[PDB]
Symmetry: D3
Subunit: 166 residues, 6 copies
Amino acid sequence: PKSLNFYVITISTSRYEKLLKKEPIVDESGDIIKQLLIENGHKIIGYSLVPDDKIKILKAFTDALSIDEVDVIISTGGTGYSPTDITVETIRKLFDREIEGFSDVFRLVSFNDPEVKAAAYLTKASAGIIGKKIVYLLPGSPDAVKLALKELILPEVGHLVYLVRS
Amino acid sequence: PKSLNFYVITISTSRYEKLLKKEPIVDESGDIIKQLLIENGHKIIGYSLVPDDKIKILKAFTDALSIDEVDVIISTGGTGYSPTDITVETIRKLFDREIEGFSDVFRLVSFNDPEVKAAAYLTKASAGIIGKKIVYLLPGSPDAVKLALKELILPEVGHLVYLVRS
Amino acid sequence: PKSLNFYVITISTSRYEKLLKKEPIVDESGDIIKQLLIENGHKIIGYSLVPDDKIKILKAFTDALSIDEVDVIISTGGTGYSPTDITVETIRKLFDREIEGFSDVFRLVSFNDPEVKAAAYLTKASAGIIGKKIVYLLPGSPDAVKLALKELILPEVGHLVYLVRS
Amino acid sequence: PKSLNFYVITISTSRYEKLLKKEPIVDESGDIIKQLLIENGHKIIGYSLVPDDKIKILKAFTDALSIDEVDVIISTGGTGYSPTDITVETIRKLFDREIEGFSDVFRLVSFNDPEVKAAAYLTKASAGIIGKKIVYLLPGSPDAVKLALKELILPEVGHLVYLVRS
Amino acid sequence: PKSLNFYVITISTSRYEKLLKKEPIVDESGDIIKQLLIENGHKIIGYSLVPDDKIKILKAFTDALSIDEVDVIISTGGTGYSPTDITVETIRKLFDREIEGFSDVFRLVSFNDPEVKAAAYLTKASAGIIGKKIVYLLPGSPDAVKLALKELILPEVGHLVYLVRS
Amino acid sequence: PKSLNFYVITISTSRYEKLLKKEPIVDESGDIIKQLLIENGHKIIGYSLVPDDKIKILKAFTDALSIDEVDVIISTGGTGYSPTDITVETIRKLFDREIEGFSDVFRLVSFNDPEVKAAAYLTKASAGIIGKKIVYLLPGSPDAVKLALKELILPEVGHLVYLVRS
Ligand SMILES: [Mg+2]
Ligand SMILES: [Mg+2]
Ligand SMILES: [Mg+2]
Ligand SMILES: [Mg+2]
């Protein structure tokens, strides 16, 4: 299988505000995505951290989309029903095609986690295609991100990139 | 855990026609919802019964939304593919935010019931948020309503109400 | 249980091009659909083969819809994320009502097939209602079509036809 | 021509807050609508005053829609681009059918007013049909309301009610 | 200037029913369209007559779209607010791209006709593009069809066909 | 009246291709916008030139939206029915609120020009609000841009900016 190039975006107001104050931050979810993607033979070619702000989130995504070498963009954060969760409403609109089934299949595997169960209906984690690039909008939770990567992204992303570019 | 205030809406033309004549009605599904809610420490602060009529359905929901003390509205009926089933089409247009995953997660738990299985794809049961209130639109079937309450609403609704109001 | 009348549409550019040249084609998925329907007491009252072309797909479907005796239309092909897959985007527009849950329940059954698993989120197989006729848009894959027929269509299609004509 | 029955809704936060404090209010726009509708042989069968609040606006409309004798509902207020203008976004969704051309034709006649001109593109005044009733969502401005009534509503509303009920 | 090939579709339930009975019909609007097109150097390469039935309307349009030589499809009938008027709702779905401004510019020219004026907001006449073919959905009214042809279609249709095939 | 800060975006593949080679460019439409704005006391705080490419268009707009000091963004190009015109389809998906009437009011003033007339229905020029900023998407034609600026933007934009920020 090909090594693919990934850009990672963390959407977290608390962490962004610390970055502004030059304070130490731990980005557990972003770290997990990088670690797993690298462990599996892929490359991280960029990373950004933004708060729950429409314009800032759009700029983070367009910056990544504008790098020709990027194959896949993965974000973590802002896909639930907190009043300030706006990631899906901001980005999903931009997809050339929504990968419609990613949302329900992610909720299916989430429902199977005995620590999640019915909480599965409280995520809007989504995937789509823009140009020849794939985009995954994942939850803030480290366990959720790990689940999405291992069960859904790592096994199929190669074939999906191939397919979209065929 | 917090006692929450619920408003129950039964959508049934046959039962509504009896109501108009003050003839006896058995509302099995509405009664199941009320009983399960009370057994779990919640309160029923309102109830209404309407037929499959767009205006009457809209009024039933707006009358409930107008009560400041209501936290959650649950309806039963009119969420399938009978020509006269219009509940979801009517009330989705009120949502501030659709709780998108409720539909497929409800169909997942329904499919898993060996008495239901593939019949799961014949429901459009849905949920959403209007203001600081949660709305669940459930099937007419007593067994479907019991499943939704026990497996999906009772376990998650407290945290969901908190989240939407945070 | 009614014998129902089915019209079968294969959407395959490679096979269509062979047709034009008057060469042998082998349509495994269409053949599977026909055999499983007949074996279950249903009738095949028409069949057509078209490429991934919008107008030709629309014509195939409207020709079938224009036959009063047709109860159900089932197509195979063009429901994935290949750049040329346009079946769902083309026909889903024509639905009076989308049978919304067919998509996710199909992906649920697909995901539980140990040979498919995560590949489940790469399909957009869908169903809908036009007039008093039911329409299923299935994948090109022979295994997917068998799964859809055995698990979802054959068990519920009788009741669904009844229901929409109620 | 028939005498038709109208329900008038004023959407104004300032006026609503005075009503709560039992203070005198002047509703110039509502008064103009009543006066002109009555001068032209029609009847006013109800009136309500609400602020720019989604739930309160929905309740005002459903209350009017639920009166069988009502033929037409006319509202004034909240159809522009103030952050708090939400009338169109709240009600337009509820239409069975939008009367699509009302919006642009109203902007056409507004553009012709030498005191409005290009300000015409800053209104979203709209019309639609719910059940057998017509709904007009008009601006807050008295001159705008007068214009809508004289040029668009009074001349055509009779035929439109007839048509919708045919 | 190209001679273009036009297909003409009349949507009229009363005239269709006469056809079935083999009685004389008189189609004034279709006749106007044909005469004005021919008089302007264009060709009529097909014609059909259908009632206000979704499937029959879809079949009329797809039959025309399936003729390679057809450049433009023009229909007359079913674009108002009669409960049986379904032309726009049916065909507008099929557009690759809606020619968005045809609707309001048609209503502008209509409004300026001193015999139409405010009746202008009661039409939904529309235009769109499917493949490399242009489609105009015009009212049933003979005067409306003449106006559309003379003021909007004949002057711009050549350039529009050129443009979409660019 | 307030001096406002504008960001001008030219969308032209031919000019962008020249830019890449640092070949001379004449951008008549962009220059007209800049000149009229400056003559009316406004400031140009940014400019970019992009081709008809979805990602590049999205980046141009997000780079402008990211400048706190920008009040209004005006683009020229790609708002017609050429197959490669994608400006409106791309940027409408960014709007918080579409300024719905800008489209038809622009077509009204365009139709009124005797050099344009029915050509008015071949544009999709649009406007919207993102955050506290206004966005106008104008045609490529120099005469169209001049008309939009003088008749629709310069007279109303000051009050509109105030309103959106109130
Ligand atoms: Mg665990
Ligand atoms: Mg059981
Ligand atoms: Mg005046
Ligand atoms: Mg001039």
